[PDB]
């Protein structure tokens, strides 16, 4: 007679049924999955089938109204750690799964929860009324675990591994409010979810592992622990990612950006190399040719060097041109080392070596102003320091290096240079908008400045930051594979990031933007004491990502 | 009154068991035994032979009572019977 305070790893507890669990469902499922041949990996005494293994944990507080959604999960073999490994050698799967819930409360609390299975074809989100489905009610004072089973309600005969199809969804909601009769600061409890395959889960058709690999099915391995710790760079400045920058207003980034369709709207490959263009007018203001600023420009839509697009040459920064003249260093400009070369043979001009500032302008021989849309604009170079002589050749070419630094007037630092007001964008790209409490984020990096090249992180003169939209391994991996059959429009792919003290969640949309649920805060996330990164899977987009650092 | 069943009805019943037991299947119900109005269209003297006058897809919205009952069910299967009534006159042909 064991007590209920100790639970065994094979123990389901109380089995809570629902009207969707029927015998004819199981018989039809087995008899129609039989077209894939005999079932595989169905030995009932194996250790990977008999035990429950960890899936998730969530929080239930007293401020949650009835009908609030606390936890959702889509039907997949990626919810178990061992059926995700075994799916690399098979081409189909069919069957159900069991989910075990443990509520960590006491006998003094009040309140109840509700769980139901949602058939495919129904949108999951706020306004989904769970209590008018066939449901099970679970008390907050329960000591033994409660397990319900999600069956396979599908319109196919089996699920192909790349393209499963329509699946059911398990949703847990709030029946009645949580009550603490004492009242005070202690108002929250925690529930843990675990998973185990059911008795009719199987695979069917064996295949070579050197077929469609694990990097073409789900983008779970695109974001790992060393990517955000010490290996990955950003897609704008090619610098070490140190933090996360919330943007509560919104932004749109076009160049060197990839969606979940294997497509780009920009004009750059996913690599950092030289910027080369020819056939552009070069000039210099004034008459004296010693210590004279150098000017160069060319129109947009003419650079025939890229197989991708001809808006700008490969590697051009997507920043609007800040206008300047005279002996004044501009504020927050993309500057980089380079020189102007001779278009007839390729011989560079040796005396015209300086740091040139790049951007997008509207009138280059006339008055100078920044511009954002690429239609009717042009690409403009102008050196920030004094250079010797100037070539007035009409087809003259420009050669700049890959990486750049910030142009600052003084030795002190400023805010993140790439603010969302001035980002040059091709017309036709979508923007990133806040969805509820979730707001778009960028990836911060320590980038040197032209007023103090010795300055690093933690310096006494301030730290200079430059931001990008995606990490570089992510956009490299997004241009090699296709993930159309991994995320519906209106969903996020969620990763859990743990720290030494707290943990937070980030999500990736179909458009290729990253999100975090922080509201209207503008504080940088430190991202120094990060420990582990774990994938979670598809979740509804109108659900708050958990953000607590403590 | 005789009720007509489909030619593929035995395979249609068995393969829909992945959704569970069948619901609203009672052959003496009054919403199921009578014909009810669906739509109307026009046949003109200027229509060439071979022209299409009417096109409808298989759906539970081509009936006033299966459209009401589809607000509380996530799934359907089975056939549907159609009937055509010409207003007409005895002096016409075609």
């Amino acid at each position: 007679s064991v007590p209920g305070t100790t639970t065994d790893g094979m123990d389901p507890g109380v089995v809570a049924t629902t009207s969707v669990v029927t015998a004819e469902n199981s018989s039809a499922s087995i008899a129609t999955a039989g077209i894939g041949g005999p079932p595989q990996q169905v030995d009932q005494q194996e250790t990977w089938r008999t035990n429950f293994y960890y899936n998730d944990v969530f929080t239930w507080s007293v401020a949650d109204a009835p009908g609030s959604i606390l936890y959702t999960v889509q039907h997949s073999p990626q919810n178990n750690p061992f059926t995700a490994v075994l799916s690399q050698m098979y081409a189909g799967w069919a069957g159900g799964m069991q989910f075990r819930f443990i509520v960590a409360g006491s006998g003094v609390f009040g309140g109840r929860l509700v769980a139901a299975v949602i058939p495919p074809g129904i949108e999951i989100g706020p306004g989904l009324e769970v209590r008018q489905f066939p449901h099970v009610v679970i008390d907050a004072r329960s000591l033994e675990p409660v397990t319900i089973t999600m069956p396979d309600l599908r319109p196919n005969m089996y699920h192909p591994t790349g393209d499963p199809g329509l699946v059911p969804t398990l949703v847990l909601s709030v029946y009645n409010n949580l009550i603490n009769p004492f009242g005070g600061s202690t108002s929250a409890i925690q529930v843990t979810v675990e998973t185990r395959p059911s008795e009719d889960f199987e695979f069917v058709m064996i295949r070579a592992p050197s077929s469609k690999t694990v990097d073409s099915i789900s983008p779970a391995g695109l974001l790992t622990t060393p990517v955000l710790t010490g290996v990955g760079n950003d897609n704008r400045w090619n610098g070490q990612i140190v933090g996360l920058q919330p943007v509560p207003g919104g932004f749109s980034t076009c160049n060197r950006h990839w969606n979940l369709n294997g497509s780009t709207y920009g004009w750059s490959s996913p690599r950092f190399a030289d910027i080369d263009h020819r056939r552009g007018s070069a000039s210099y203001p004034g008459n004296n040719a010693t210590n004279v600023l150098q000017f160069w420009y060319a129109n947009a839509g003419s650079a025939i060097d890229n197989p991708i697009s001809q808006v700008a040459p490969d590697g051009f920064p997507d920043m609007s041109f800040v206008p300047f003249n005279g002996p004044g260093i501009p504020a927050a400009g993309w500057v980089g080392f380079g020189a102007i070369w001779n278009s007839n043979s390729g011989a560079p001009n040796v005396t015209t070596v300086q740091a040139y500032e790049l951007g997008f302008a509207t009138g280059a021989p006339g008055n100078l102003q920044p511009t954002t849309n690429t239609s009717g604009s042009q690409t403009v170079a102008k050196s920030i320091y004094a250079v010797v002589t100037g070539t007035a050749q009409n087809p003259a070419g420009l050669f700049v290096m890959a990486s750049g630094v910030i142009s600052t007037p003084s030795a002190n630092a400023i805010t993140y240079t790439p603010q969302p007001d001035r980002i040059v964008t091709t017309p036709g790209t979508p923007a990133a908008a806040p969805v509820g409490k979730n707001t778009p984020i960028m990836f911060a990096s320590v980038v040197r400045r032209t007023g103090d090249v010795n300055a690093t992180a933690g310096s006494a003169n301030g730290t200079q930051y430059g931001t990008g939209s995606q990490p570089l391994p992510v956009t490299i991996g997004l241009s090699l594979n296709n993930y159309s059959s991994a995320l519906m429009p209106g969903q996020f792919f969620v990763w859990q990031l743990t720290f030494a003290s707290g943990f937070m969640e980030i999500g990736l949309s179909v458009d290729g933007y990253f999100y975090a649920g922080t509201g209207a805060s503008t504080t940088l996330i430190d991202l120094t004491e990060l420990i582990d990164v774990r994938p979670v899977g598809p979740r509804p987009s109108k659900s708050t990502l958990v953000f607590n650092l403590g | 009154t005789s009720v007509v069943t489909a030619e593929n009805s035995s395979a249609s019943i068995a393969t829909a068991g992945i959704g569970g037991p069948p619901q609203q299947v009672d052959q003496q119900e009054t919403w199921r035994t009578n014909f009810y109005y669906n739509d109307v269209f026009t046949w003109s003297v200027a229509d060439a032979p071979g022209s299409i006058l009417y096109t409808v897809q298989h759906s539970p919205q081509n009936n006033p009572f299966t459209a009401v009952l589809s607000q509380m069910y996530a799934g359907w299967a089975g056939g549907m019977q159609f009937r055509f009534i010409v207003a007409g006159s005895g002096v016409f042909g075609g």
């Binding site: 004819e24 018989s27 129609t32 039989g34 | 035995s10 068995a14 068991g17």
Partner: peptide
């Protein structure tokens, strides 16, 4: 599995 084919046969 057997009940499915049995029902379709019957």
């Amino acid at each position: 599995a057997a009940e499915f084919f049995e029902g379709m046969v019957h």
